[PDB]
Amino acid sequence: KIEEGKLVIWINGDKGYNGLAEVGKKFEKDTGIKVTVEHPDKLEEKFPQVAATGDGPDIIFWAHDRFGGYAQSGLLAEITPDKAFQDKLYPFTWDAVRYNGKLIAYPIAVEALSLIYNKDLLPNPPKTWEEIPALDKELKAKGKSALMFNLQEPYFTWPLIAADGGYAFKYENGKYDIKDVGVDNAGAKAGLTFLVDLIKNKHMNADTDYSIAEAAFNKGETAMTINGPWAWSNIDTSKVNYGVTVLPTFKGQPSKPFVGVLSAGINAASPNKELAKEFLENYLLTDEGLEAVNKDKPLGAVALKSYEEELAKDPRIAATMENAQKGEIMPNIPQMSAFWYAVRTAVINAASGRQTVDEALKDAQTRITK
Ligand SMILES: [Xe]
């Protein structure tokens, strides 16, 4: 019983669901078809449970990485956008919504870490990681540090580790090779070594976590931090005069942050797949549709080229997209959980001195492929 003749959509409570409902009202004016938007608690946990029994919403919106698990269980319908429509979104976003080769969702928005800096302390942020040691000594002469960011979670340290060549799983020809892991290769070793060197050279502290770094930046103690769009409102409140820019390069290569793509999937059990496609393609994924959602709650950078080009007039959003285009789409496979735990341990151990960089990464690589 998935009520055919209408559309029921699930989206998280922190998104612009009121704006999404407005798009649904327009769809109804045009077609006479009602669209009901809901934002239940723990909807990402409820979806697999109810879709498994043939129930649930016609459409679900969530970060793409969770869709791999849903596709794994046959909960999502293969979508059918033609080449012309696919051409309206940035090509890399389509790589975040493929499972076993099949497209299983529509990309909506894009999120990645950026370099955030204090324009008063540093109106000219560094383009390379290599110049941060010198910069830190300079700022320290005035009682300020160059950079503080969360060193406890791989999500935040990976950009640097991947810069020169590290990667979670090799993706080539629309699919991941679970046996091809780039955690102990020369590039990862180079990046982690630079990170560890920053710590023993006293430019960064191995125990700095999310709260500590955010506090330091918003209090004007450090000139830079690395964070995502979810952190901007707290900085706005702090009144720090900040900028958001491209992450520094390492060995001349862009830092590579994981990319999260808010996406829309269609329930495999939905008797309204055609309605869903019409709604998603021709109402939501248009400048007018995304604008309606964005006005309610900002989407950040979006997958639709025409609207991203307008949003990008805000340099912070432009930065998010630039870093995302240079980043690594987050793998949507189950082995990614093994990657998180293993890398988390490797970095913590390398930073604390418990393990050398080579041994910490060697052990992590073994765990992930084992
Ligand atoms: Xe949305």
XYZ file of C-alpha atoms and ligand atoms in Angstrom:
371
model
C 0.000 0.000 0.000
C 2.023 2.946 -1.297
C -1.008 5.052 -2.274
C -0.768 5.287 -6.048
C -2.028 8.517 -7.565
C 0.017 10.761 -5.291
C 3.577 11.244 -4.050
C 4.786 10.917 -0.508
C 8.279 12.261 0.086
C 10.583 11.818 3.079
C 13.353 14.365 3.771
C 15.229 15.196 6.981
C 13.961 17.852 9.354
C 17.024 20.045 8.871
C 16.355 20.530 5.133
C 14.005 22.992 3.429
C 10.981 20.732 3.512
C 8.574 23.670 3.523
C 10.235 24.866 0.341
C 10.074 21.347 -1.092
C 6.336 21.321 -0.270
C 5.986 24.513 -2.332
C 7.418 22.679 -5.318
C 4.879 19.951 -4.613
C 2.039 22.497 -4.654
C 3.140 23.664 -8.110
C 3.230 20.073 -9.325
C -0.342 19.669 -8.046
C -1.590 22.849 -9.772
C -0.212 21.545 -13.066
C -1.171 17.893 -12.823
C -3.738 17.658 -10.062
C -1.463 15.236 -8.249
C -0.929 15.864 -4.551
C 2.546 15.750 -3.066
C 2.962 15.234 0.664
C 6.328 16.015 2.248
C 7.156 14.449 5.622
C 10.212 14.599 7.863
C 9.960 11.732 10.387
C 12.593 11.139 13.039
C 15.327 8.668 12.188
C 13.885 8.469 8.687
C 17.134 6.958 7.333
C 16.656 4.034 9.735
C 12.907 3.782 9.191
C 13.165 3.690 5.410
C 14.974 0.341 5.172
C 12.523 -1.194 7.637
C 9.329 -0.057 5.908
C 10.581 -0.380 2.320
C 11.575 -3.973 3.083
C 7.866 -4.722 3.623
C 6.773 -2.852 0.483
C 5.715 0.323 2.268
C 7.280 3.732 2.848
C 7.552 6.960 0.779
C 7.664 7.124 -3.012
C 10.767 9.313 -2.725
C 13.444 9.581 -0.056
C 16.101 12.314 0.201
C 19.395 11.594 1.988
C 23.179 11.789 1.589
C 24.129 9.346 -1.192
C 26.403 7.115 0.853
C 23.422 5.603 2.680
C 21.797 4.688 -0.663
C 24.361 1.972 -1.333
C 22.957 -0.039 1.563
C 19.400 0.580 0.335
C 20.304 -0.438 -3.267
C 22.033 -3.479 -1.800
C 18.620 -4.612 -0.534
C 16.766 -3.700 -3.711
C 14.931 -0.813 -2.068
C 15.570 1.722 -4.867
C 14.311 1.771 -8.441
C 16.831 2.226 -11.204
C 16.204 5.731 -12.494
C 15.888 6.612 -16.162
C 17.141 10.147 -16.952
C 18.080 10.550 -20.635
C 21.489 11.880 -21.694
C 20.116 15.386 -22.161
C 18.937 15.583 -18.560
C 22.128 13.995 -17.236
C 23.967 16.744 -19.031
C 22.273 19.390 -16.867
C 24.099 18.255 -13.708
C 27.866 18.267 -13.068
C 29.180 14.895 -14.347
C 30.888 13.919 -11.101
C 27.600 14.017 -9.175
C 26.262 11.096 -11.235
C 29.126 8.975 -9.909
C 27.763 9.360 -6.368
C 24.422 7.725 -7.301
C 25.421 4.573 -9.129
C 25.282 1.079 -7.576
C 26.392 -2.015 -9.441
C 26.573 0.269 -12.435
C 22.920 1.326 -12.267
C 21.835 4.898 -11.485
C 19.706 4.674 -8.330
C 19.078 8.313 -7.386
C 19.077 11.902 -8.558
C 21.839 14.158 -7.238
C 20.523 17.329 -5.586
C 23.236 19.102 -3.582
C 26.981 18.801 -2.964
C 28.954 19.175 0.256
C 32.685 19.073 1.032
C 35.199 20.668 3.435
C 36.861 23.977 2.551
C 39.622 26.066 4.076
C 38.073 28.759 6.283
C 40.265 31.693 7.262
C 40.228 34.848 9.368
C 40.577 37.767 6.932
C 41.754 40.130 9.656
C 44.660 37.877 10.726
C 45.283 36.463 7.275
C 43.798 38.359 4.308
C 45.960 36.195 2.065
C 45.482 32.484 2.930
C 48.217 29.987 1.882
C 47.799 28.092 -1.365
C 50.007 25.232 -0.180
C 50.271 23.070 2.922
C 54.040 23.419 2.659
C 53.990 27.084 3.626
C 51.969 26.582 6.811
C 54.924 25.799 9.094
C 56.588 29.149 8.314
C 53.295 30.984 8.536
C 52.623 29.489 11.971
C 55.977 30.693 13.364
C 55.112 34.209 12.131
C 51.665 34.291 13.687
C 53.001 32.744 16.905
C 55.214 35.843 17.284
C 51.935 37.707 17.803
C 50.213 35.091 19.932
C 48.171 33.438 17.169
C 48.455 30.038 15.480
C 48.098 29.345 11.778
C 45.752 26.386 11.694
C 43.544 24.255 13.897
C 41.141 21.583 12.694
C 39.751 18.246 13.908
C 42.617 15.724 13.960
C 40.591 12.966 15.651
C 38.416 11.997 12.688
C 39.678 10.702 9.298
C 36.946 12.679 7.548
C 38.895 15.848 8.377
C 42.480 14.619 7.895
C 41.920 12.625 4.682
C 42.011 15.678 2.380
C 45.741 16.053 3.039
C 46.435 12.294 3.130
C 44.783 11.815 -0.241
C 46.357 14.863 -1.926
C 49.454 13.086 -3.200
C 47.727 9.833 -4.083
C 45.829 8.183 -1.258
C 42.280 6.921 -1.910
C 39.772 4.674 -0.159
C 38.678 2.427 -2.991
C 39.590 2.578 -6.670
C 36.689 3.716 -8.803
C 37.015 3.164 -12.531
C 34.275 2.583 -15.083
C 31.415 3.332 -12.718
C 32.344 0.768 -10.069
C 34.534 0.303 -6.972
C 37.158 -2.450 -6.740
C 36.940 -3.479 -3.093
C 40.414 -5.043 -3.278
C 42.090 -1.859 -4.513
C 42.732 0.322 -1.457
C 45.105 3.272 -1.384
C 45.775 3.712 2.317
C 49.409 2.628 2.494
C 50.600 3.807 -0.910
C 53.380 6.412 -1.308
C 50.921 9.296 -1.615
C 49.082 8.471 1.621
C 52.375 8.009 3.410
C 53.584 11.373 2.165
C 50.448 13.157 3.344
C 50.271 11.530 6.752
C 53.993 12.162 7.212
C 53.450 15.896 6.592
C 50.572 15.870 9.034
C 52.613 14.134 11.720
C 55.547 16.471 11.099
C 53.238 19.444 11.707
C 52.372 17.928 15.052
C 55.869 17.168 16.289
C 57.069 20.556 15.082
C 54.463 21.985 17.409
C 52.468 23.641 14.635
C 49.462 21.491 15.618
C 48.480 19.475 18.706
C 47.611 15.769 18.347
C 44.650 16.126 20.715
C 42.833 18.896 18.868
C 39.285 17.773 18.115
C 36.197 19.372 16.571
C 35.148 21.471 19.539
C 38.635 22.706 20.372
C 39.327 23.805 16.779
C 35.959 25.476 16.307
C 36.444 27.298 19.599
C 39.917 28.495 18.637
C 38.795 29.803 15.270
C 35.578 31.456 16.402
C 37.468 33.120 19.261
C 40.034 34.511 16.806
C 42.906 32.492 18.273
C 43.879 30.685 15.081
C 43.932 32.086 11.538
C 42.494 29.050 9.784
C 40.407 25.940 10.255
C 39.063 23.249 7.925
C 35.352 22.703 8.124
C 32.115 22.364 6.233
C 29.050 24.566 5.533
C 27.326 23.241 8.670
C 29.842 25.274 10.617
C 29.245 28.657 8.985
C 26.333 29.777 11.204
C 28.412 29.436 14.370
C 31.113 31.564 12.719
C 28.455 34.122 11.672
C 27.422 34.406 15.321
C 31.059 34.773 16.423
C 31.403 37.868 14.220
C 34.822 36.716 13.037
C 35.503 38.255 9.585
C 35.929 35.008 7.653
C 36.458 33.758 4.135
C 35.984 30.255 2.704
C 38.411 29.093 0.057
C 40.093 26.272 -1.821
C 41.974 23.874 0.429
C 45.796 24.096 0.256
C 47.668 21.869 -2.223
C 50.234 19.312 -1.102
C 53.173 18.514 -3.336
C 51.368 20.674 -5.897
C 48.248 18.460 -5.852
C 44.789 19.516 -4.655
C 43.719 18.318 -1.222
C 40.930 15.799 -1.737
C 37.971 16.037 0.656
C 35.211 13.430 0.662
C 32.124 14.642 -1.192
C 28.601 14.065 0.167
C 25.731 14.327 -2.345
C 22.173 14.871 -1.059
C 20.178 12.675 -3.414
C 16.610 11.643 -4.200
C 15.841 7.948 -4.580
C 12.567 6.338 -5.716
C 11.156 3.456 -3.672
C 11.432 0.178 -5.637
C 7.883 -0.603 -4.392
C 6.382 2.680 -5.539
C 3.504 2.429 -8.054
C 4.280 6.067 -8.885
C 7.750 5.861 -10.470
C 6.755 7.920 -13.514
C 5.223 10.648 -11.304
C 8.384 10.678 -9.193
C 10.599 11.082 -12.261
C 8.428 13.890 -13.653
C 8.491 15.666 -10.298
C 12.199 15.256 -9.681
C 13.385 16.030 -13.198
C 11.029 18.753 -14.336
C 9.944 20.476 -11.143
C 12.624 20.080 -8.488
C 15.801 19.969 -10.590
C 15.105 23.351 -12.223
C 16.285 26.808 -11.114
C 12.792 27.524 -9.824
C 12.490 24.302 -7.840
C 15.892 24.466 -6.145
C 15.319 28.157 -5.453
C 12.103 27.297 -3.614
C 13.977 24.811 -1.428
C 17.051 26.986 -0.997
C 14.946 29.974 0.180
C 13.489 27.825 2.966
C 16.837 26.293 4.067
C 20.057 26.670 2.016
C 21.136 23.653 0.021
C 24.713 24.869 -0.205
C 26.273 23.984 -3.583
C 23.907 22.225 -6.003
C 24.306 19.577 -8.687
C 22.315 21.522 -11.295
C 24.758 23.646 -13.329
C 22.375 26.505 -14.153
C 21.443 27.183 -10.553
C 24.942 26.492 -9.117
C 26.209 29.205 -11.458
C 23.925 31.686 -9.706
C 24.610 30.388 -6.186
C 28.342 30.556 -6.815
C 28.169 34.362 -6.678
C 28.604 33.673 -2.929
C 32.330 32.860 -2.748
C 31.763 30.407 0.113
C 29.463 28.267 -2.036
C 31.863 28.582 -4.985
C 34.594 27.292 -2.651
C 32.517 24.345 -1.542
C 31.939 23.302 -5.177
C 35.585 23.824 -6.169
C 36.825 21.629 -3.329
C 34.129 19.039 -4.090
C 35.140 18.881 -7.747
C 38.714 18.296 -6.595
C 37.649 15.772 -3.960
C 36.753 12.099 -3.647
C 33.066 11.072 -3.870
C 32.388 9.171 -0.612
C 32.190 5.417 -1.456
C 28.684 4.040 -1.001
C 29.839 0.436 -0.370
C 29.781 -1.415 2.998
C 33.567 -1.796 3.128
C 33.762 1.951 3.644
C 32.956 1.266 7.339
C 36.161 -0.803 7.552
C 38.066 2.116 5.996
C 36.783 4.610 8.582
C 37.769 2.554 11.627
C 41.132 1.477 10.251
C 42.190 4.975 9.111
C 40.913 6.557 12.274
C 43.257 4.286 14.238
C 46.198 4.752 11.905
C 46.053 8.546 12.073
C 45.532 8.638 15.836
C 48.466 6.258 16.350
C 50.762 8.123 13.940
C 49.960 11.468 15.541
C 50.524 10.174 19.079
C 53.784 8.491 18.160
C 52.424 5.088 19.146
C 53.125 3.923 15.589
C 55.332 5.299 12.827
C 53.469 6.546 9.740
C 54.570 3.577 7.653
C 53.467 0.989 10.242
C 50.193 2.751 11.081
C 49.181 2.881 7.421
C 50.507 -0.612 6.699
C 48.216 -2.000 9.427
C 45.220 0.007 8.242
C 45.630 -1.163 4.624
C 45.793 -4.771 5.812
C 42.534 -4.398 7.780
C 40.545 -2.791 4.967
C 41.439 -5.330 2.259
C 41.491 -8.250 4.687
Xe 15.531 18.930 -1.714
